[PDB]
Structures are given as C-alpha cells and as structure tokens.
C-alpha cells in the first residue's frame, strides 16, 4: 500500500517537532524526505526538523564566508556548515 505521510496540519502535535533529536548519522543519511513540504524530513511517522550530532572531525575546508567540516560518528559521514 502507498504509505501516506501524516498530514502537515498535525505535525506540531508531536513533542519532537520543536526538539533537537539525536540520531545515528547513517539513519539521517538513509531516511527519506516529505513531498508536501520540502525542507523537512520524515522518519517512522515522526517528523524531524532539528538534529544533534557528535564525533571526530576528519575534514576541514574554508570559504569566503562559511566554513566546512566533515564529521564522523563511527557509522557515517556528513558535511557541516558554520
């Protein structure tokens, strides 16, 4: 069956929407997005808007106005913008 994402009119009823969630980096890599509202992501019925990661930096790059950082948390790597 076509898994229908929960309607956007009921996202805020979750207590997780306004919080900083802790996730495995592989999960945040492999977890899907939402079509009705781009820019936000949906995981197992719980919409997620904010994440918190921790690990060892393994990549540094500088630009005109924003830094770059490649973090690792023993399962995957994601870029960071500061």
């Amino acid at each position: 069956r076509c898994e229908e994402e929960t309607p956007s009119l009921l996202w805020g009823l979750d207590p997780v929407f306004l919080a900083f969630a802790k996730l495995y980096i592989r999960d945040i890599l492999d977890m899907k997005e939402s079509r009705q509202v781009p820019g936000v992501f949906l995981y197992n019925g719980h919409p997620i808007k904010q994440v918190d990661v921790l690990g060892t930096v393994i990549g540094v790059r500088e630009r005109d106005a924003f830094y770059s950082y490649g973090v690792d948390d023993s399962t995957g790597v994601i870029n960071c913008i500061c």
Partner: protein, 121 residues
C-alpha cells in the same frame, strides 16, 4: 568524503577477519616507536594472549610518543605481501585512564541493537 570508521577489537583484526581496504578504528597500548622507518607497534592484552598491530605514521608527523600508554587509531588497512596487515593512520589520539570493559560492553551492546533492528528487514 571518506568511508566511515567501524569499531573492531584488537584480536579480530589481529586474525585478519576484515576485508582488505576496509576502514577500521581500534585501540591498544604502544610498545615501540621505530624512529627511522616510521612504524609503530602497539599491543593489547587478552587473558593470556597478546596481539600486535603495525601502524604506519607517515601522515601525522610531527608526533610525540608516550611509551606504555593507550591509543586510538583510525584509518585504512592494507594487506601487505610480507609485513602482513598495517593500518594507514589518518588520526591518532592518546587517551589514558579510560577503562576497557566499559568500551567493550559498549560496542557489544551497539552491535546487538544493530542486529536486533536488522531482524525486521
């Protein structure tokens, strides 16, 4: 971007239970720092058994050495023809006082949870 670093206790990698070219992160205690050839031999105990891992260091010079201390090494493994297994260091930090059993139980629990979540797919 590089590949992630999975944990591995010393005795498994000592027996060569990982594919060549994989990226791994392990621990141990330093035993000797061969100055001229840029080679590090660290050791880790296991009951009555002691295991040895060879670490190339050509990417972290300059580097202070603390004889008889624990270490954490992250990098890639290359199966050499005669030297056997040597890990190419990318980051090599020193930690002291951290108890091993908590760490070993931690990776055991994480592996168990990953396998448990793997039982649904």
């Amino acid at each position: 971007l590089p590949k992630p670093g999975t944990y591995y206790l010393p005795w498994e990698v000592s027996a060569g239970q990982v594919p060549d070219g994989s990226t791994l992160r392990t621990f141990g205690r330093l035993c000797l720092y061969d100055m001229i050839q840029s080679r590090v031999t660290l050791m880790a105990q296991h009951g009555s058994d002691q295991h040895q891992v060879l670490v190339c260091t050509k990417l972290v010079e300059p580097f202070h050495a603390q004889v008889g201390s624990l270490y954490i090494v992250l990098g890639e493994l290359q199966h050499q023809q005669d030297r056997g297994s040597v890990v190419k260091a990318r980051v090599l930090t020193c930690v002291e006082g951290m108890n091993l059993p908590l760490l070993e139980q931690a990776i055991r629990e994480q592996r168990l949870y990953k396998q448990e979540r793997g039982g649904s797919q």
